Design a protein around this ligand. Sequence first.
Ligand SMILES: O=C(CC(O)(CC(=O)NCCCCNCCCNC(=O)c1ccc(O)c(O)c1)C(=O)O)NCCCCNCCCNC(=O)c1ccc(O)c(O)c1
Ligand SMILES: [Ga+3]
Length: 173
Amino acid sequence: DLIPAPPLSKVPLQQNFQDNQFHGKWYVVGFAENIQQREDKDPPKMIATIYELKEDKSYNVTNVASNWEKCTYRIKTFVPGSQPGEFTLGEIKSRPGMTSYLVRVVSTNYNQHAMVFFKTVVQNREKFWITLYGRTKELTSELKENFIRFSKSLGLPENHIVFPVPIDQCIDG
Ligand SMILES: O=C(CC(O)(CC(=O)NCCCCNCCCNC(=O)c1ccc(O)c(O)c1)C(=O)O)NCCCCNCCCNC(=O)c1ccc(O)c(O)c1
Ligand SMILES: [Ga+3]
């Protein structure tokens, strides 16, 4: 029953993607995925994803998160794909059984919010998710509604949609 990925042609790409303007810290204020919202857990803590543009035009991507022990810094590379705003994972060989990792910036105004679509295939199991990014940790009802609406348009119902809890530890860095 795991929810199938939509066809990539149904996933918008941000027109005229500006990689310099997309840089820096985004708070992951919402997310939806085909796999789960788990189902035996308190609501998750917010993470930050930091996009640093390298000289070769790929992104160094740092996920900053809080766990009971400490702040974690998980780093990967987004290499440009065929169109501005599309990426694939540099370190794909480091993911056992992974044959594909695709990123598509669906929309953004650069200084406030973004939505990013992700898709992965690992031993022929397809996973996809959408993140709602904010330059601030709080966002308007307006944006939360757009995101919910977008998620549903990709076949993700409301019980697959999660709004992480803002924290100060780790992600204020
Ligand atoms: O196999 C995976 C899954 C995946 O490749 C992709 C995946 O399925 N992501 C699911 C994210 C669902 C949304 N979660 C809630 C929202 C907050 N998270 C994100 O926005 C987000 C977005 C993208 C990510 O890849 C990610 O990890 C998280 C991934 O990188 O997470 N991860 C483990 C990789 C192990 C690498 N070898 C061990 C070294 C230690 N790990 C890392 O350094 C590292 C670095 C960057 C990573 O993204 C990472 O997951 C691990
Ligand atoms: Ga990861």
